[PDB]
Design an enzyme around this catalytic site. Structure first.
Site, PDB file in Angstrom:
ATOM      1  N   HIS A   1     -12.300 -11.538  -0.378  1.00  0.00           N
ATOM      2  CA  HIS A   1     -13.427 -11.937  -1.197  1.00  0.00           C
ATOM      3  C   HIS A   1     -14.235 -10.710  -1.668  1.00  0.00           C
ATOM      4  CE1 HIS A   1     -16.803 -15.125  -1.858  1.00  0.00           C
ATOM      5  NE2 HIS A   1     -17.088 -14.038  -2.554  1.00  0.00           N
TER       6      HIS A   1
ATOM      7  N   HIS B   1     -16.373  -8.590  -5.085  1.00  0.00           N
ATOM      8  CA  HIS B   1     -16.957  -8.394  -6.423  1.00  0.00           C
ATOM      9  C   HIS B   1     -16.854  -6.951  -6.847  1.00  0.00           C
ATOM     10  CE1 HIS B   1     -18.592 -12.481  -6.599  1.00  0.00           C
ATOM     11  NE2 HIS B   1     -18.707 -12.324  -5.291  1.00  0.00           N
ATOM     12  N   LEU B   2     -16.156  -6.711  -7.952  1.00  0.00           N
ATOM     13  CA  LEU B   2     -15.996  -5.348  -8.456  1.00  0.00           C
ATOM     14  C   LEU B   2     -16.811  -5.084  -9.695  1.00  0.00           C
ATOM     15  CD1 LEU B   2     -12.148  -4.637  -8.058  1.00  0.00           C
ATOM     16  CD2 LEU B   2     -14.101  -3.598  -6.722  1.00  0.00           C
ATOM     17  N   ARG B   3     -17.464  -6.114 -10.231  1.00  0.00           N
ATOM     18  CA  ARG B   3     -18.247  -5.984 -11.472  1.00  0.00           C
ATOM     19  C   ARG B   3     -17.416  -5.401 -12.611  1.00  0.00           C
ATOM     20  NH1 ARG B   3     -21.385  -9.584  -8.833  1.00  0.00           N
ATOM     21  NH2 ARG B   3     -22.812  -8.604  -7.382  1.00  0.00           N
TER      22      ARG B   3
ATOM     23  N   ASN C   1     -16.798 -13.859 -11.459  1.00  0.00           N
ATOM     24  CA  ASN C   1     -18.154 -14.083 -11.984  1.00  0.00           C
ATOM     25  C   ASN C   1     -18.760 -12.875 -12.748  1.00  0.00           C
ATOM     26  OD1 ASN C   1     -18.504 -12.652  -9.565  1.00  0.00           O
ATOM     27  ND2 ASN C   1     -20.519 -13.575  -9.161  1.00  0.00           N
TER      28      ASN C   1
ATOM     29  N   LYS D   1     -11.762 -20.023  -8.394  1.00  0.00           N
ATOM     30  CA  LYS D   1     -13.021 -20.014  -7.644  1.00  0.00           C
ATOM     31  C   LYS D   1     -13.981 -21.057  -8.205  1.00  0.00           C
ATOM     32  CE  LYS D   1     -16.260 -18.331  -4.791  1.00  0.00           C
ATOM     33  NZ  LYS D   1     -16.716 -16.936  -5.117  1.00  0.00           N
TER      34      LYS D   1
ATOM     35  N   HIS E   1     -17.345 -21.675  -3.151  1.00  0.00           N
ATOM     36  CA  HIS E   1     -18.721 -21.342  -2.777  1.00  0.00           C
ATOM     37  C   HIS E   1     -19.367 -22.669  -2.437  1.00  0.00           C
ATOM     38  CE1 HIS E   1     -22.644 -19.042  -2.969  1.00  0.00           C
ATOM     39  NE2 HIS E   1     -23.034 -20.301  -2.925  1.00  0.00           N
TER      40      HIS E   1
ATOM     41  N   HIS F   1     -17.251 -17.206   2.509  1.00  0.00           N
ATOM     42  CA  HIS F   1     -18.464 -16.663   3.194  1.00  0.00           C
ATOM     43  C   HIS F   1     -19.264 -17.728   3.917  1.00  0.00           C
ATOM     44  CE1 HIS F   1     -20.200 -18.243  -0.424  1.00  0.00           C
ATOM     45  NE2 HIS F   1     -20.162 -17.139  -1.153  1.00  0.00           N
TER      46      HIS F   1
ATOM     47  N   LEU G   1     -26.297 -14.627  -0.736  1.00  0.00           N
ATOM     48  CA  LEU G   1     -26.011 -16.055  -0.672  1.00  0.00           C
ATOM     49  C   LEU G   1     -24.608 -16.231  -0.058  1.00  0.00           C
ATOM     50  CD1 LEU G   1     -27.255 -17.322  -4.158  1.00  0.00           C
ATOM     51  CD2 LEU G   1     -28.611 -17.188  -2.097  1.00  0.00           C
TER      52      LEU G   1
ATOM     53  N   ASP H   1     -17.356 -10.155   0.733  1.00  0.00           N
ATOM     54  CA  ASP H   1     -18.240 -10.509  -0.349  1.00  0.00           C
ATOM     55  C   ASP H   1     -19.108  -9.295  -0.781  1.00  0.00           C
ATOM     56  OD1 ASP H   1     -19.266 -12.180  -2.290  1.00  0.00           O
ATOM     57  OD2 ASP H   1     -20.846 -12.990  -1.049  1.00  0.00           O
TER      58      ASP H   1
ATOM     59  N   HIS I   1     -25.410  -4.518  -6.750  1.00  0.00           N
ATOM     60  CA  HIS I   1     -26.394  -4.559  -7.813  1.00  0.00           C
ATOM     61  C   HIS I   1     -27.138  -3.230  -7.776  1.00  0.00           C
ATOM     62  CE1 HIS I   1     -26.097  -8.940  -8.338  1.00  0.00           C
ATOM     63  NE2 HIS I   1     -25.953  -8.989  -7.025  1.00  0.00           N
TER      64      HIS I   1
ATOM     65  N   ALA J   1     -29.188 -11.452  -5.530  1.00  0.00           N
ATOM     66  CA  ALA J   1     -28.454 -11.753  -4.316  1.00  0.00           C
ATOM     67  C   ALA J   1     -27.160 -10.950  -4.226  1.00  0.00           C
ATOM     68  CB  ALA J   1     -28.116 -13.252  -4.262  1.00  0.00           C
TER      69      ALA J   1
END
Ligand SMILES: NC(=O)N[C@@H](CC(=O)O)C(=O)O
Ligand SMILES: O=C1C[C@@H](C(=O)O)NC(=O)N1
Ligand SMILES: [Zn+2]
Ligand SMILES: [Zn+2]
Ligand SMILES: [Zn+2]
Ligand SMILES: [Zn+2]
EC number: 3.5.2.3
Lengths: 344, 343
Positions: free
Chosen positions: B13, B15-17, B41, B99, B136, B174, B219, B247, B251, B263
């Site tokens: 899980h 996030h690489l943006r 996302n 997802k 989620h 998560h 979150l 996760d 940011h 978050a």
């Protein structure tokens, strides 16, 4: 024609004015509107002597703009090392209106706080004797107690035993935030009162945490779940006469709120009164708004009710986005929002 | 002195943006992990094979030479997603999973799923093709207290769904509560979960006592200690349908430390050593490798990695910040001493 709400001039029964330049900036937001305020003693170092309270009072009076009729009501910070004779002299001389008890902590320096209620019985017994009210920040701060449980835990572990032991002591349960506390106060006697802040009436913890983390809603005692919010609104809306206005206006520079470790406190002095007016109106209980702001507090403290009046008007205004400090800025409660009620 | 050698892990899980942030954060993953589930996302979200293929190339472009890293792409489910789009992506080796973000529940979720009923044909097709559903699991009704949203989801959405599609493979992503831990513990072989380092290491007191800590704000929200303790017990038990999902959700510092902080914890730099600490603390290091490197591949039907890494029990200082071009990034445990580091 916009609706007018005229009230006897209110007072703020729980206020932080800080010191130095910050005090100069924040005092006018109180003195313009309130006749008197309970000024809390948690300076660095804290106000624990008559002489420091006297000097602080004068610093406050120096910062009141010309023509504002404002009287600061001073307090002593309760500590282990505090001599009960110093507290009594202060009360007798009209310097201390009340004394403030912050949560006990076994590791606290004796010049800066209380290790246990037991440790300060001589002083509490002296307040009971002379009729000095005790203002309580009622949370137990032990590391193994979940933050949202701390207020309820205090009722059971500290407040009830304390009051069972000192049956003549007048106590204000400051800035109550839970149904536990609202019920406790509702079911108490004439020696038990409470203040409630505008944020604990208007919001709950979802407003601080859903859709982002909002450090300007971060304060102690922490915002609780909605059922507690509702119990607070019902309590003030009921006309119960031992709850009254205490803002807990607790200003921190923006840099100290919006950081990796945000300070606790809402700078609500600028917008508190209108916020209370909005809450009472939403609860169909405006008939009790005056008593809450201007009468209940004075009755509990044995002080006269103010004899001048102020007016709120139901006309939309925008709250400032920020308020300049010498260095940095303050972000007020409801910064940038359109509010429903404002002082005329 | 103590060295712990494990099969090279994966991150199930992540996030690489995109853009600069992507270029900065990918190396913290690609240097350690063999593979990662790359969540979808983005803004706009990855909801087509074409977007996923291009995104995958942007990711590979940012992987340093020498790193053997494969991004496993995901589809962002929306109410109006064509089940054929998702199935073509699965058939072409583009989408590893899909997802489900409940609309408005989390970061970049405004375009998310409004109900299970709205996407049944898509879920039925996932069930038919054997594509895992990553969830989620929170409800979003404004009336529901934030700390209750995960528990309420189990009851109102997860259990009905799984009863309706009895062959659908689901990762409860998560997880943060005893409710979810017991639910997963008592589930069948078609149900798994990921747990982050922060939900093992901390509870809500760590985010709120002594100050508000936005770098721990993520979150689903950090819960009570009783929940944290349940999650630790679950991973410590050797239960084999729980596995590593950081996760990691970066940011820029200014976005974290604002009047309305975003978050997510940027935990990629420190996650693996943090898990090691938790497992060591629970007297369960014999179960560590499986969590990091075996359980996820088993659930996903993929081979385990064939290389090995070492963790050493030498106390190391985590950086205070990591530079971006026009920003900074604060790592999870910034400025802390961390007990285990990758050798
Ligand atoms: N979990 C988070 O707090 N943040 C994640 C989104 C997610 O996993 O829900 C993000 O992408 O920012
Ligand atoms: O107990 C307190 C203290 C106050 C302050 O900042 O002085 N701020 C709060 O949020 N509550
Ligand atoms: Zn207080
Ligand atoms: Zn206060
Ligand atoms: Zn999520
Ligand atoms: Zn995520």
């Amino acid at each position: 024609p916009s609706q007018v709400l005229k009230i006897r001039r209110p007072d703020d029964w729980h206020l932080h004015l800080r010191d130095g330049d910050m005090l100069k900036t924040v005092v006018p937001y109180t003195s313009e509107i309130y006749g008197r305020a309970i000024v809390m003693p948690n300076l660095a170092p804290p106000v624990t002597t008559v002489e420091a309270a006297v000097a602080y009072r004068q610093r406050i009076l120096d910062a009141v703009p010309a023509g504002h009729d404002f009287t600061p009501l001073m307090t002593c910070y309760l500590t282990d090392s505090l001599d009960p004779n110093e507290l009594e002299r202060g009360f007798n001389e009209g310097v201390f209106t009340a004394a403030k008890l912050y949560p006990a902590n076994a590791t606290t320096n004796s010049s800066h706080g209380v290790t246990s209620v037991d440790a300060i019985m001589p002083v509490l017994e002296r307040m009971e004797k002379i009729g000095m009210p005790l203002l309580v920040h009622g949370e137990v701060t032990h590391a193994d107690i979940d933050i949202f449980d701390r207020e309820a835990r205090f009722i059971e572990s500290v407040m009830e035993p304390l009051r069972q032991r000192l049956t003549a002591l007048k106590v204000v349960f400051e800035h109550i935030t839970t149904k536990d506390a609202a019920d406790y106060v509702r079911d108490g006697n004439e020696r038990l009162a409470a203040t409630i802040t505008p944020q604990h009436l208007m919001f709950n913890r979802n407003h601080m945490l859903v859709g982002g983390v909002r450090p300007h809603l971060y304060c102690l005692p922490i915002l609780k779940r909605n059922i507690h919010q509702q119990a607070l609104r019902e309590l003030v809306a009921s006309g119960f006469n031992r709850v009254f206005l205490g803002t807990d206006s607790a200003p921190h520079a923006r840099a100290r709120k919006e950081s990796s470790c945000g300070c606790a406190g809402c700078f609500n002095a600028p917008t508190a009164l209108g916020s209370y007016a909005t809450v009472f109106e939403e609860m169909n209980a405006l008939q009790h708004f005056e008593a809450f702001c201007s009468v209940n507090g004075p009755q509990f403290y044995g002080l006269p009710v103010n004899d001048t009046f102020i007016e709120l008007v139901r006309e939309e205004q925008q709250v400032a986005e920020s308020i300049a400090l010498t260095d940095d800025t303050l972000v007020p409660f409801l910064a940038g929002e359109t509010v429903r009620w404002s002082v005329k």
